[PDB]
């Protein structure tokens, strides 16, 4: 007859969300308290990741309803506050600044701070950038909104690859489709131990340091035609940027308290030179073209470009971190033309007091780096927003970096967390031995 027969370990799963786990690479070369993403208790990963490919299975994906990108954005915020918890407060620095110019984008400001002794007062000088200071005869930019905790010079903001790994009893489903939606069914899915190397960069309008595509450029949104959500244009090839801060800055240590040392910018030496980035001209020229082909597939007419209309300074420019210093690059040279080594040069302005995530609270002061600064941007994606209601003859794609979950959705689009239900009931012709 047909009697039940329960099987333990059936390969069936359900769409359910759980909490992930950091697992960095076997690179414990610390030698200093560093790696604000890994911190002190992110475990080493598997040296041999057990990537397991499946067949005869088509599971639907939804990278905008993914809960991994909500959990990633909560951790990076949590790591940002946790690393700044023991760092030096800038409470006594919120005094009236006496600022005189150098010529420029730097003012020398002389202020009053208490020493380690609670009664003595010293007057010291410090180079402060122009957008770090609001007029009052000057003050810092947001001392009258919230407190400022400067970044500890020991730690580093270089994003190491961290693998978010589901606990035992769960799984992560990786889609292997070369040209894939974003949201929709995937013909080639593969369960993995956990994810690939993900660099938790912070960047607006330009997805730096990520994964590339294999076949061609994929344009991704919720449904594209809606103007309210940003469009993630995941590149195939990577253009080359050589960003720099080509002026010599000296780090000056200012005594503000017992153990609390305020590292400001000392006397500038050499040439007063602007920070610039070389985003080729030839690789970008072919890049926008190949972007045009994918954007013209989803439309029927010409597709133009235009720089960002407005907002805060951190979205109208191209923000990122370049060796512990936060840049703000003017990306008007990239997107101006109306589409259907002689390098282009981006004027980037440096800010130290940065209020990342725009959460009311800690806004860190990045200490200056001694000497020249050079980094290597790489671009594996773009962040574009469609324009409003116009005629059908052309459409405008303003660049824009919205909520930071759009950065993580460029790397967590492949993955999906499901729970494993190994109990399963299925009828068979077997019956156990009867009692009587």
């Amino acid at each position, epitope marked *: 007859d047909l009697w039940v027969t329960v099987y333990y370990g059936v390969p069936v799963w359900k769409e359910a969300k759980t909490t992930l786990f950091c697992a960095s690479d076997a690179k414990a070369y610390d030698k200093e308290v560093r790696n604000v993403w890994a911190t002190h208790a992110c475990v080493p990963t598997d040296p041999n990741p057990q990537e397991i490919v499946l067949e005869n299975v088509t599971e639907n994906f939804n990278m905008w309803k993914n809960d991994m990108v909500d959990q990633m954005h909560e951790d990076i915020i949590s790591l940002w506050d946790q690393s700044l918890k023991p760092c030096v407060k800038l409470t006594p620095l919120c005094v009236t600044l006496n600022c005189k110019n150098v010529n420029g984008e730097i003012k020398n400001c002389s202020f009053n701070t208490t020493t380690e002794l609670r009664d003595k007062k010293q007057k010291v000088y410090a180079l402060f950038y122009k957008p770090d200071v609001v007029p009052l005869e000057y003050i810092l930019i947001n001392c009258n909104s919230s407190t400022i905790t400067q970044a500890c010079p020991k730690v580093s903001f270089d994003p190491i690859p961290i693998h978010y790994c589901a606990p035992a009893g769960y799984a992560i489903l990786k889609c292997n489709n070369k040209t894939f939606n974003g949201t929709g069914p995937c013909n080639n899915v593969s369960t993995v131990q956990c994810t690939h190397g993900i660099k938790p960069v912070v960047s607006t309008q330009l997805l730096l340091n990520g994964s590339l595509a294999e076949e061609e450029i994929i344009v991704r949104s919720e449904n594209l035609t809606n103007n309210i959500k940003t469009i993630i244009v995941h590149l195939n090839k990577s253009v080359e940027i050589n960003c720099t801060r080509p002026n010599n800055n000296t780090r000056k240590s200012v005594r503000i308290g017992p153990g609390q040392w305020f590292y400001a910018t000392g006397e500038i030496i050499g040439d007063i030179r602007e920070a610039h980035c070389n985003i080729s001209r030839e690789t970008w020229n072919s890049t926008l073209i190949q972007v045009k082909e994918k954007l013209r597939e989803h439309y029927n007419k010409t597709i133009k470009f235009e720089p960002s209309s*407005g907002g805060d300074l951190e979205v109208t420019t191209h923000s990122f971190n370049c060796r512990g210093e936060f840049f703000y690059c003017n990306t008007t040279k990239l997107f101006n033309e109306t589409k259907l080594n002689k390098t282009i040069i981006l004027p980037c302005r440096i800010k130290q007091i940065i209020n990342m995530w725009q959460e009311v609270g800690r806004a860190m002061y990045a200490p200056p780096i001694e000497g020249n600064i050079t980094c290597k941007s790489n671009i594996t994606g773009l962040l574009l927003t469609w324009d*409003g209601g*116009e005629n059908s003859t052309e459409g405008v794609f303003r660049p824009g970096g919205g909520n930071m979950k759009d950065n993580w959705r460029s790397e967590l689009y492949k993955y999906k967390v499901v729970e494993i239900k190994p109990l399963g009931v299925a009828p068979t012709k077997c019956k156990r031995k009867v009692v009587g």
Partner: antibody
Amino acid sequence: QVQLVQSRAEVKKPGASVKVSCEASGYNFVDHYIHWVRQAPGQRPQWVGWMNPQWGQVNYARTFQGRVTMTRDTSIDTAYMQLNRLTSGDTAVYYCATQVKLDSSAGYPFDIWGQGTMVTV
Amino acid sequence: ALTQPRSVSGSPGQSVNISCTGAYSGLGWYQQHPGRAPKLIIYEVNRRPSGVSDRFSGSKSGNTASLTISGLRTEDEADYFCSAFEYFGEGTKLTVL
């Protein structure tokens, strides 16, 4: 609770600038986008643009590009919209719109609207 | 390119029924009471938001949005707007005899 309250109605001369504010209370002001939409008294309602209060990230229709600037004051939960180069054809009632109490994450349509600000130039 | 008629007839007990054609037509419908801001009555052509009566409903087609209200009252006299993303319709005024 969870409402949008606008400023008083204004009548201005051509060429002058007007500022239509829209304060928000009772809900997460930052997390929800603030749309601005017109309605002329005797014409179809015309959509101006949207503005999310995280960084501002303003988006404009081409018929208002270069004339309207939307700023914000997130410390007091206020969303602004300032029109420059006002003309005779810029008469309507100006509504601030958002989407809070809906289960659709697509951002359209709107459900919660302001009290209204009739602007006649 | 979102068009709708201006006035359709009706009577208490007889359904008032509005067409609205266009690309992605009838994502949302608004009932603008005369004097104040409009109010959402249906979103995603057929789904019903909270705070509105059960008699408010809509039906979908290939390109035309059909808003059907059954059991009219005297207090429902308002202007009806058909919306599609950022676009909007012309506007339909209720007629109750």
